[PDB]
Amino acid sequence: VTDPEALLLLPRLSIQNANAISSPLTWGFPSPGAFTGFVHALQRRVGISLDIELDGVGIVCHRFEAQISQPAGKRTKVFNLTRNPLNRDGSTAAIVEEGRAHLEVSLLLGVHGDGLDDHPAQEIARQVQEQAGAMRLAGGSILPWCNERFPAPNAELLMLGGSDEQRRKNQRRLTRRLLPGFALVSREALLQQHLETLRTTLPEATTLDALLDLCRINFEPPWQVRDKPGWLVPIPAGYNALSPLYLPGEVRNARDRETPLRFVENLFGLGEWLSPHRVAALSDLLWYHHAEPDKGLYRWSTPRFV
Amino acid sequence: GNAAALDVFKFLSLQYQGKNLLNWLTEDSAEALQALSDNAEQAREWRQAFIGITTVKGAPASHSLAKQLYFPLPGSGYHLLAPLFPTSLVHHVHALLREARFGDAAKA
Amino acid sequence: ILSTASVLAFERKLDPSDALMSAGAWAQRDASQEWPAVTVREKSVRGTISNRLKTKDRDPAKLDASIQSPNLQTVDVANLPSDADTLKVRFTLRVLGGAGTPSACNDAAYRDKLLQTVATYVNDQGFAELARRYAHNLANARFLWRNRVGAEAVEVRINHIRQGEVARAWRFDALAIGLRDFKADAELDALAELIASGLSGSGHVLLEVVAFARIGDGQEVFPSQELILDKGDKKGQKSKTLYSVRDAAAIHSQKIGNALRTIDTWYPDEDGLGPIAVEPYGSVTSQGKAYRQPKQKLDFYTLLDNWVLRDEAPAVEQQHYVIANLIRGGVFGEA
RNA sequence: CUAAGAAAUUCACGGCGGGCUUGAUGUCCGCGUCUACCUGAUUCACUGCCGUAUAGGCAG
């Protein structure tokens, strides 16, 4: 919703057991809403004391490992589980299938505020790094890099460049820092135009079918494969309204009785993983919240991408 | 609900006149309220109880073990936003994947 | 009236990393940064029927027919190399601050009462006994589990990482410190002071825990076995599967946490076992029996509602158990 | 303020029984690789003498 005055690079963060089930329809890399919520929790915890705002997160995902296995005779996969403790009668409890993933991601954070002029860049960078080293990113603990060879501090780069060439060199150096990974971006325009292409191909086609067609490998008879522009993952694109926004004390057993609750349904969109050298600026990769609370639509996206 | 009352689900899902009986009981039709009860008041209470399977029962509530996730408003606010599992959408996607992976045309 | 909060959840304080397992030689433990990792391999087993028979297949003809059909499995096995008698197990522990602060709470009054109860607990005795028992369970390598059973010598090195360097190095003989006695030692008290300051603090305390076990040359190490459901599939699967991160055998973090939380020596049953893991309703998976039942007034939930709501503060041991549950975490709250 | 918060998979296992893959075989015709280039930038921080000296100086 705003252009960041600076970009803070949180380095390689090893998230231990992240929620591999991103959505009721998708598994794998966690939701971008988890990353945006983590950055908002960082702004809630240490952002206010530094007189800065932390909005917008760019994910690089340097490493992914899924705690999964492939059973013999099946081409699908299953989630490795954890043994929950027994009940009070000594019996095994009912198992809820929860999957885990070891992530290694680096985050670009959009920083704007007067506190950037009040503190050194390395000071606020080290403060938000030591705050983020005791938090969670998708349900997993963050490994804060103890007793390895060379630890990685941040590099907060001011986006108000004095010259266009110096700004370009800063963005290319920051892209070179986060090199072995893929920027995950939102593709609402690509999914909508592919929906229009399928509607010209066949009418009454929903956005779900256009999302599904952009993920399966289509085999065409003369036997070739229908190509895709990018990786084109199905991402959770936010939450849509399923109920009116009830009063803060209205909903029974809410998390807090001061925040209003509204039952939601998952919104599914198309995301794309790209090499981060294929972007004009690294501020395009930032994932922003977008509530629009009168109509539900509690989305996260990448505005100012293309 | 229970695993024994579910028989009455087909008693709300037959096609007698060519349409589903829940949409037949959502309207005050002439053939309705006479085909199931001779008395008027018994027909009214049976129609109300049979149409109450769609409306949510009890207070609006989400349990502690359910997920609740704060969402930042643009200006100074949060919404708690408890999500529910879209079992209709999941069933539709699973049906489409069944046609895609084990259908007769797909296997051909 | 101080009703209990309908959601009440606590973060996992003392959250460990996955215990990376590597191999090497004893007296080369100082240069253990380049030790090759233990790799999980596959092998085949042909056993014979040795389970109990239910008096319908005990006839000699059917039993001989069952033996005549060969029983075969594939098992994931982790072994030491035949020139490395020492198993090194390394993980990172983050002692998080705000141990008595819940993640979620409905009632503001219940949150204030719980914070006041925890604050009186820190003002009375602190986390000093609990961090002593946590430093004990770090000091003996209970997180090695079956790697600790037949080892010649186990030694635990624990390094406090303040910013990027070892702020303080502790060295413990893990076999000398028992699995069931919680005694007093100067280095153990210093580690207890550090862990209690991390629990009482606002940030986190970072520790690197490395355990060297002299199991034997080429012996079988025991990483955590992965819980994979067969789900009634037709094709036979591998019976035993292990855990690894990247060609490197590992133990699950919850197993290391369960070994770290094995401090509960205050359950109403007899302590023939010794300490058990801090669980609500005192569940022990190795026994199939749950101590600290709610029919007695010593389960975690009734102790919390007595300590917080009705102001019936229990004994100091049960207060230690309650705060150990709060450090452990969990999802509580009636409907 | 993160489909948040939470979790011990596990105990034991004999895969060996045995084996002739063989015969037979044309790779072969044909070819312009040229032109033009300072390794040297203090690039040898080197040798000896006076001085107990590692402290400090001198000579070509």
PDB file of C-alpha atoms in Angstrom, chain A residues 31-272:
ATOM      1  CA  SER A  31       1.101 -19.791   3.421  1.00  0.00           C
ATOM      2  CA  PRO A  32       2.362 -16.286   2.576  1.00  0.00           C
ATOM      3  CA  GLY A  33      -0.123 -15.144   5.219  1.00  0.00           C
ATOM      4  CA  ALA A  34       2.140 -16.808   7.786  1.00  0.00           C
ATOM      5  CA  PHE A  35       5.053 -14.679   6.578  1.00  0.00           C
ATOM      6  CA  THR A  36       3.016 -11.456   6.555  1.00  0.00           C
ATOM      7  CA  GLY A  37       1.687 -12.273  10.030  1.00  0.00           C
ATOM      8  CA  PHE A  38       5.232 -12.938  11.242  1.00  0.00           C
ATOM      9  CA  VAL A  39       6.380  -9.551   9.941  1.00  0.00           C
ATOM     10  CA  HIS A  40       3.379  -7.876  11.570  1.00  0.00           C
ATOM     11  CA  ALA A  41       4.207  -9.665  14.839  1.00  0.00           C
ATOM     12  CA  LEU A  42       7.787  -8.396  14.491  1.00  0.00           C
ATOM     13  CA  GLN A  43       6.427  -4.867  14.045  1.00  0.00           C
ATOM     14  CA  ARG A  44       4.095  -5.434  17.007  1.00  0.00           C
ATOM     15  CA  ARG A  45       6.927  -6.626  19.261  1.00  0.00           C
ATOM     16  CA  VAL A  46       9.996  -4.568  18.307  1.00  0.00           C
ATOM     17  CA  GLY A  47       8.865  -2.356  15.429  1.00  0.00           C
ATOM     18  CA  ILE A  48       7.025   0.172  17.603  1.00  0.00           C
ATOM     19  CA  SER A  49       9.962   0.627  20.000  1.00  0.00           C
ATOM     20  CA  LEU A  50      12.275   1.386  17.049  1.00  0.00           C
ATOM     21  CA  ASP A  51       9.833   4.036  15.666  1.00  0.00           C
ATOM     22  CA  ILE A  52       9.619   2.158  12.341  1.00  0.00           C
ATOM     23  CA  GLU A  53       6.944   0.246  10.450  1.00  0.00           C
ATOM     24  CA  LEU A  54       7.455  -3.237   8.994  1.00  0.00           C
ATOM     25  CA  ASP A  55       5.088  -3.892   6.083  1.00  0.00           C
ATOM     26  CA  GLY A  56       5.784  -6.130   3.108  1.00  0.00           C
ATOM     27  CA  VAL A  57       7.793  -9.364   3.041  1.00  0.00           C
ATOM     28  CA  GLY A  58       9.670 -10.967   0.164  1.00  0.00           C
ATOM     29  CA  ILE A  59      10.291 -14.711   0.538  1.00  0.00           C
ATOM     30  CA  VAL A  60      13.310 -16.375  -1.077  1.00  0.00           C
ATOM     31  CA  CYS A  61      13.101 -19.966   0.318  1.00  0.00           C
ATOM     32  CA  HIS A  62      16.729 -21.054   0.127  1.00  0.00           C
ATOM     33  CA  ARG A  63      15.919 -24.636   1.163  1.00  0.00           C
ATOM     34  CA  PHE A  64      12.827 -26.812   1.571  1.00  0.00           C
ATOM     35  CA  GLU A  65      12.564 -30.315   3.020  1.00  0.00           C
ATOM     36  CA  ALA A  66       9.218 -32.027   3.578  1.00  0.00           C
ATOM     37  CA  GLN A  67       8.756 -34.600   6.352  1.00  0.00           C
ATOM     38  CA  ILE A  68       6.920 -36.932   3.981  1.00  0.00           C
ATOM     39  CA  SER A  69       7.294 -40.446   2.626  1.00  0.00           C
ATOM     40  CA  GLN A  70       6.130 -42.303  -0.463  1.00  0.00           C
ATOM     41  CA  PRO A  71       4.446 -45.636   0.356  1.00  0.00           C
ATOM     42  CA  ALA A  72       5.174 -48.541  -1.957  1.00  0.00           C
ATOM     43  CA  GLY A  73       2.634 -49.085  -4.715  1.00  0.00           C
ATOM     44  CA  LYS A  74       1.310 -45.504  -4.632  1.00  0.00           C
ATOM     45  CA  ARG A  75       2.411 -42.429  -6.567  1.00  0.00           C
ATOM     46  CA  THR A  76       1.025 -40.095  -3.883  1.00  0.00           C
ATOM     47  CA  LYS A  77       2.673 -39.243  -0.553  1.00  0.00           C
ATOM     48  CA  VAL A  78       1.818 -39.347   3.146  1.00  0.00           C
ATOM     49  CA  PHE A  79       2.833 -37.145   6.062  1.00  0.00           C
ATOM     50  CA  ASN A  80       5.162 -38.421   8.758  1.00  0.00           C
ATOM     51  CA  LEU A  81       3.538 -37.929  12.146  1.00  0.00           C
ATOM     52  CA  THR A  82       4.472 -37.270  15.761  1.00  0.00           C
ATOM     53  CA  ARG A  83       3.492 -39.553  18.635  1.00  0.00           C
ATOM     54  CA  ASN A  84       1.146 -37.499  20.794  1.00  0.00           C
ATOM     55  CA  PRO A  85       1.026 -38.331  24.525  1.00  0.00           C
ATOM     56  CA  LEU A  86      -1.433 -40.921  25.772  1.00  0.00           C
ATOM     57  CA  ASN A  87      -4.787 -40.079  27.311  1.00  0.00           C
ATOM     58  CA  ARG A  88      -5.588 -40.271  31.021  1.00  0.00           C
ATOM     59  CA  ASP A  89      -6.704 -43.915  30.647  1.00  0.00           C
ATOM     60  CA  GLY A  90      -3.429 -44.964  29.005  1.00  0.00           C
ATOM     61  CA  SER A  91      -4.838 -45.297  25.478  1.00  0.00           C
ATOM     62  CA  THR A  92      -3.568 -43.733  22.268  1.00  0.00           C
ATOM     63  CA  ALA A  93      -5.367 -40.509  21.378  1.00  0.00           C
ATOM     64  CA  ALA A  94      -7.051 -39.836  18.046  1.00  0.00           C
ATOM     65  CA  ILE A  95      -4.468 -38.835  15.446  1.00  0.00           C
ATOM     66  CA  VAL A  96      -4.765 -35.527  13.602  1.00  0.00           C
ATOM     67  CA  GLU A  97      -2.616 -35.776  10.477  1.00  0.00           C
ATOM     68  CA  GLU A  98      -0.275 -32.777  10.698  1.00  0.00           C
ATOM     69  CA  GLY A  99       2.680 -32.456   8.345  1.00  0.00           C
ATOM     70  CA  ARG A 100       5.980 -30.729   9.015  1.00  0.00           C
ATOM     71  CA  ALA A 101       8.649 -29.114   6.867  1.00  0.00           C
ATOM     72  CA  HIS A 102      12.172 -27.814   7.437  1.00  0.00           C
ATOM     73  CA  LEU A 103      12.496 -24.443   5.716  1.00  0.00           C
ATOM     74  CA  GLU A 104      15.421 -22.094   5.146  1.00  0.00           C
ATOM     75  CA  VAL A 105      14.097 -18.725   3.979  1.00  0.00           C
ATOM     76  CA  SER A 106      15.392 -15.159   3.870  1.00  0.00           C
ATOM     77  CA  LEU A 107      13.008 -12.227   4.166  1.00  0.00           C
ATOM     78  CA  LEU A 108      12.988  -8.771   2.590  1.00  0.00           C
ATOM     79  CA  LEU A 109      11.147  -6.379   4.911  1.00  0.00           C
ATOM     80  CA  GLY A 110       9.795  -3.002   3.869  1.00  0.00           C
ATOM     81  CA  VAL A 111      10.772  -0.367   6.438  1.00  0.00           C
ATOM     82  CA  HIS A 112       9.269   3.123   6.526  1.00  0.00           C
ATOM     83  CA  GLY A 113       9.164   5.644   9.350  1.00  0.00           C
ATOM     84  CA  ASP A 114      11.125   8.419  11.012  1.00  0.00           C
ATOM     85  CA  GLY A 115      13.054   5.958  13.207  1.00  0.00           C
ATOM     86  CA  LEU A 116      15.230   5.107  10.198  1.00  0.00           C
ATOM     87  CA  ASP A 117      16.644   8.614  10.673  1.00  0.00           C
ATOM     88  CA  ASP A 118      16.886   8.141  14.454  1.00  0.00           C
ATOM     89  CA  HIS A 119      18.984   4.950  14.642  1.00  0.00           C
ATOM     90  CA  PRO A 120      21.845   3.369  12.700  1.00  0.00           C
ATOM     91  CA  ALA A 121      20.699   0.873  10.077  1.00  0.00           C
ATOM     92  CA  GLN A 122      22.698  -1.975  11.614  1.00  0.00           C
ATOM     93  CA  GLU A 123      21.241  -1.185  15.055  1.00  0.00           C
ATOM     94  CA  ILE A 124      17.592  -1.554  14.004  1.00  0.00           C
ATOM     95  CA  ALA A 125      18.567  -4.493  11.777  1.00  0.00           C
ATOM     96  CA  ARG A 126      20.239  -6.293  14.693  1.00  0.00           C
ATOM     97  CA  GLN A 127      17.298  -5.471  16.974  1.00  0.00           C
ATOM     98  CA  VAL A 128      14.715  -6.952  14.602  1.00  0.00           C
ATOM     99  CA  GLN A 129      17.007  -9.948  13.962  1.00  0.00           C
ATOM    100  CA  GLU A 130      17.419 -10.730  17.663  1.00  0.00           C
ATOM    101  CA  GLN A 131      13.674 -10.277  18.092  1.00  0.00           C
ATOM    102  CA  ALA A 132      12.966 -12.639  15.177  1.00  0.00           C
ATOM    103  CA  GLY A 133      15.434 -15.224  16.500  1.00  0.00           C
ATOM    104  CA  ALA A 134      13.026 -16.108  19.339  1.00  0.00           C
ATOM    105  CA  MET A 135       9.810 -16.316  17.294  1.00  0.00           C
ATOM    106  CA  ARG A 136       7.966 -18.657  14.918  1.00  0.00           C
ATOM    107  CA  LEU A 137       7.345 -18.273  11.192  1.00  0.00           C
ATOM    108  CA  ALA A 138       4.878 -20.988  10.158  1.00  0.00           C
ATOM    109  CA  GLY A 139       4.517 -23.005  13.342  1.00  0.00           C
ATOM    110  CA  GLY A 140       8.193 -23.952  13.566  1.00  0.00           C
ATOM    111  CA  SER A 141      11.056 -22.845  15.769  1.00  0.00           C
ATOM    112  CA  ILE A 142      13.721 -20.671  14.151  1.00  0.00           C
ATOM    113  CA  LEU A 143      17.257 -22.030  14.390  1.00  0.00           C
ATOM    114  CA  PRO A 144      19.359 -18.980  15.329  1.00  0.00           C
ATOM    115  CA  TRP A 145      22.680 -20.287  13.889  1.00  0.00           C
ATOM    116  CA  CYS A 146      24.823 -21.283  16.859  1.00  0.00           C
ATOM    117  CA  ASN A 147      28.467 -22.435  16.579  1.00  0.00           C
ATOM    118  CA  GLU A 148      28.731 -22.636  12.797  1.00  0.00           C
ATOM    119  CA  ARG A 149      31.492 -21.044  10.704  1.00  0.00           C
ATOM    120  CA  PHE A 150      30.276 -17.588   9.684  1.00  0.00           C
ATOM    121  CA  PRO A 151      26.964 -16.105  10.883  1.00  0.00           C
ATOM    122  CA  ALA A 152      25.040 -13.717   8.666  1.00  0.00           C
ATOM    123  CA  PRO A 153      23.930 -10.296   9.965  1.00  0.00           C
ATOM    124  CA  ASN A 154      21.306  -8.264   8.123  1.00  0.00           C
ATOM    125  CA  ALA A 155      21.884  -5.586   5.498  1.00  0.00           C
ATOM    126  CA  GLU A 156      19.295  -2.810   5.664  1.00  0.00           C
ATOM    127  CA  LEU A 157      19.484  -0.950   2.351  1.00  0.00           C
ATOM    128  CA  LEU A 158      17.788   2.426   2.009  1.00  0.00           C
ATOM    129  CA  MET A 159      15.518   2.521  -1.036  1.00  0.00           C
ATOM    130  CA  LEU A 160      15.862   6.324  -1.294  1.00  0.00           C
ATOM    131  CA  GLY A 161      18.907   6.123  -3.530  1.00  0.00           C
ATOM    132  CA  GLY A 162      20.861   9.250  -4.369  1.00  0.00           C
ATOM    133  CA  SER A 163      21.333   8.073  -7.957  1.00  0.00           C
ATOM    134  CA  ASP A 164      19.589   5.532 -10.167  1.00  0.00           C
ATOM    135  CA  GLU A 165      22.836   3.643 -10.808  1.00  0.00           C
ATOM    136  CA  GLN A 166      23.646   3.434  -7.086  1.00  0.00           C
ATOM    137  CA  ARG A 167      20.105   2.212  -6.359  1.00  0.00           C
ATOM    138  CA  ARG A 168      20.468  -0.347  -9.167  1.00  0.00           C
ATOM    139  CA  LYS A 169      23.818  -1.546  -7.783  1.00  0.00           C
ATOM    140  CA  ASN A 170      22.326  -1.807  -4.278  1.00  0.00           C
ATOM    141  CA  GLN A 171      19.375  -3.855  -5.562  1.00  0.00           C
ATOM    142  CA  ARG A 172      21.676  -6.148  -7.556  1.00  0.00           C
ATOM    143  CA  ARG A 173      23.933  -6.700  -4.528  1.00  0.00           C
ATOM    144  CA  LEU A 174      20.882  -7.449  -2.363  1.00  0.00           C
ATOM    145  CA  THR A 175      19.692  -9.898  -5.035  1.00  0.00           C
ATOM    146  CA  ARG A 176      23.162 -11.484  -5.048  1.00  0.00           C
ATOM    147  CA  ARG A 177      22.891 -11.985  -1.276  1.00  0.00           C
ATOM    148  CA  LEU A 178      19.630 -13.971  -1.567  1.00  0.00           C
ATOM    149  CA  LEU A 179      20.790 -15.969  -4.581  1.00  0.00           C
ATOM    150  CA  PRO A 180      20.073 -19.742  -3.966  1.00  0.00           C
ATOM    151  CA  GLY A 181      16.317 -19.305  -3.747  1.00  0.00           C
ATOM    152  CA  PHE A 182      13.132 -18.340  -5.545  1.00  0.00           C
ATOM    153  CA  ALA A 183      10.940 -15.303  -4.974  1.00  0.00           C
ATOM    154  CA  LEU A 184       7.312 -16.339  -4.468  1.00  0.00           C
ATOM    155  CA  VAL A 185       4.939 -13.799  -6.027  1.00  0.00           C
ATOM    156  CA  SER A 186       1.200 -13.503  -6.610  1.00  0.00           C
ATOM    157  CA  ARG A 187      -0.265 -13.971 -10.102  1.00  0.00           C
ATOM    158  CA  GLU A 188      -3.876 -12.769  -9.976  1.00  0.00           C
ATOM    159  CA  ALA A 189      -3.550 -11.210 -13.445  1.00  0.00           C
ATOM    160  CA  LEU A 190      -2.065 -14.381 -14.970  1.00  0.00           C
ATOM    161  CA  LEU A 191      -4.716 -16.590 -13.340  1.00  0.00           C
ATOM    162  CA  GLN A 192      -7.500 -14.252 -14.492  1.00  0.00           C
ATOM    163  CA  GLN A 193      -6.231 -14.148 -18.083  1.00  0.00           C
ATOM    164  CA  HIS A 194      -5.847 -17.942 -18.073  1.00  0.00           C
ATOM    165  CA  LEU A 195      -9.438 -18.136 -16.810  1.00  0.00           C
ATOM    166  CA  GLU A 196     -10.503 -15.943 -19.745  1.00  0.00           C
ATOM    167  CA  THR A 197      -8.497 -18.170 -22.111  1.00  0.00           C
ATOM    168  CA  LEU A 198     -10.262 -21.272 -20.767  1.00  0.00           C
ATOM    169  CA  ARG A 199     -13.639 -19.500 -20.970  1.00  0.00           C
ATOM    170  CA  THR A 200     -12.935 -18.849 -24.643  1.00  0.00           C
ATOM    171  CA  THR A 201     -11.919 -22.518 -24.877  1.00  0.00           C
ATOM    172  CA  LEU A 202     -14.967 -23.745 -22.927  1.00  0.00           C
ATOM    173  CA  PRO A 203     -17.687 -21.672 -21.186  1.00  0.00           C
ATOM    174  CA  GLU A 204     -18.970 -21.813 -17.553  1.00  0.00           C
ATOM    175  CA  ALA A 205     -15.455 -22.637 -16.309  1.00  0.00           C
ATOM    176  CA  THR A 206     -14.758 -21.544 -12.746  1.00  0.00           C
ATOM    177  CA  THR A 207     -11.562 -19.983 -11.412  1.00  0.00           C
ATOM    178  CA  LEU A 208     -10.899 -23.258  -9.557  1.00  0.00           C
ATOM    179  CA  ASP A 209     -10.606 -25.159 -12.848  1.00  0.00           C
ATOM    180  CA  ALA A 210      -8.282 -22.503 -14.282  1.00  0.00           C
ATOM    181  CA  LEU A 211      -6.173 -22.759 -11.123  1.00  0.00           C
ATOM    182  CA  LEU A 212      -6.112 -26.560 -11.438  1.00  0.00           C
ATOM    183  CA  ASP A 213      -5.145 -26.407 -15.134  1.00  0.00           C
ATOM    184  CA  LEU A 214      -2.172 -24.177 -14.248  1.00  0.00           C
ATOM    185  CA  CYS A 215      -0.785 -26.844 -11.891  1.00  0.00           C
ATOM    186  CA  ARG A 216      -1.388 -30.245 -13.500  1.00  0.00           C
ATOM    187  CA  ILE A 217       0.804 -31.422 -16.363  1.00  0.00           C
ATOM    188  CA  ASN A 218      -1.471 -31.395 -19.400  1.00  0.00           C
ATOM    189  CA  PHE A 219      -0.704 -34.047 -22.008  1.00  0.00           C
ATOM    190  CA  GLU A 220      -1.796 -33.131 -25.523  1.00  0.00           C
ATOM    191  CA  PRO A 221      -2.353 -35.660 -28.331  1.00  0.00           C
ATOM    192  CA  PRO A 222      -0.464 -35.229 -31.638  1.00  0.00           C
ATOM    193  CA  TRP A 223       2.203 -36.764 -27.080  1.00  0.00           C
ATOM    194  CA  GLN A 224       3.679 -33.508 -25.774  1.00  0.00           C
ATOM    195  CA  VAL A 225       3.191 -31.548 -22.547  1.00  0.00           C
ATOM    196  CA  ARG A 226       1.379 -28.211 -22.463  1.00  0.00           C
ATOM    197  CA  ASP A 227       3.937 -25.740 -21.139  1.00  0.00           C
ATOM    198  CA  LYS A 228       3.618 -23.210 -18.321  1.00  0.00           C
ATOM    199  CA  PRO A 229       5.077 -19.693 -17.958  1.00  0.00           C
ATOM    200  CA  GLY A 230       6.613 -20.455 -14.548  1.00  0.00           C
ATOM    201  CA  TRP A 231       6.390 -22.778 -11.573  1.00  0.00           C
ATOM    202  CA  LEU A 232       2.723 -21.787 -10.980  1.00  0.00           C
ATOM    203  CA  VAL A 233       1.943 -23.238  -7.556  1.00  0.00           C
ATOM    204  CA  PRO A 234      -1.537 -23.053  -5.995  1.00  0.00           C
ATOM    205  CA  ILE A 235      -1.252 -20.738  -2.989  1.00  0.00           C
ATOM    206  CA  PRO A 236      -3.748 -19.744  -0.284  1.00  0.00           C
ATOM    207  CA  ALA A 237      -4.623 -16.242  -1.473  1.00  0.00           C
ATOM    208  CA  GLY A 238      -6.440 -15.124   1.668  1.00  0.00           C
ATOM    209  CA  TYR A 239      -9.741 -15.523   3.480  1.00  0.00           C
ATOM    210  CA  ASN A 240     -13.272 -14.758   2.273  1.00  0.00           C
ATOM    211  CA  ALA A 241     -16.258 -14.016   4.493  1.00  0.00           C
ATOM    212  CA  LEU A 242     -18.410 -16.954   5.575  1.00  0.00           C
ATOM    213  CA  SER A 243     -20.331 -15.127   8.327  1.00  0.00           C
ATOM    214  CA  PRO A 244     -21.122 -11.563   9.411  1.00  0.00           C
ATOM    215  CA  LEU A 245     -18.502  -9.846  11.560  1.00  0.00           C
ATOM    216  CA  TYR A 246     -19.737 -10.634  15.058  1.00  0.00           C
ATOM    217  CA  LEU A 247     -19.092  -8.553  18.167  1.00  0.00           C
ATOM    218  CA  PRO A 248     -15.850  -9.114  20.157  1.00  0.00           C
ATOM    219  CA  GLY A 249     -17.744 -10.697  23.041  1.00  0.00           C
ATOM    220  CA  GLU A 250     -20.321 -12.396  20.819  1.00  0.00           C
ATOM    221  CA  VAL A 251     -18.335 -15.423  19.635  1.00  0.00           C
ATOM    222  CA  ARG A 252     -18.007 -18.160  22.245  1.00  0.00           C
ATOM    223  CA  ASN A 253     -14.467 -19.472  22.959  1.00  0.00           C
ATOM    224  CA  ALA A 254     -12.732 -16.822  20.856  1.00  0.00           C
ATOM    225  CA  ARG A 255      -8.988 -16.178  21.186  1.00  0.00           C
ATOM    226  CA  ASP A 256      -9.697 -12.817  22.827  1.00  0.00           C
ATOM    227  CA  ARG A 257     -12.938 -11.051  23.715  1.00  0.00           C
ATOM    228  CA  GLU A 258     -11.690  -7.686  22.399  1.00  0.00           C
ATOM    229  CA  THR A 259     -11.075  -8.627  18.715  1.00  0.00           C
ATOM    230  CA  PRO A 260     -14.125  -9.199  16.473  1.00  0.00           C
ATOM    231  CA  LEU A 261     -14.460 -12.671  14.972  1.00  0.00           C
ATOM    232  CA  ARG A 262     -15.826 -13.663  11.568  1.00  0.00           C
ATOM    233  CA  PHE A 263     -15.897 -17.206  10.210  1.00  0.00           C
ATOM    234  CA  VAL A 264     -13.955 -17.424   6.940  1.00  0.00           C
ATOM    235  CA  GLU A 265     -13.220 -19.741   4.032  1.00  0.00           C
ATOM    236  CA  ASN A 266      -9.819 -20.140   2.383  1.00  0.00           C
ATOM    237  CA  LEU A 267      -9.182 -18.221  -0.836  1.00  0.00           C
ATOM    238  CA  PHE A 268      -7.004 -19.986  -3.403  1.00  0.00           C
ATOM    239  CA  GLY A 269      -4.901 -18.159  -5.975  1.00  0.00           C
ATOM    240  CA  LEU A 270      -1.971 -18.778  -8.286  1.00  0.00           C
ATOM    241  CA  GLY A 271       1.555 -18.080  -7.092  1.00  0.00           C
ATOM    242  CA  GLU A 272       4.808 -18.208  -9.040  1.00  0.00           C
TER     243      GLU A 272
END
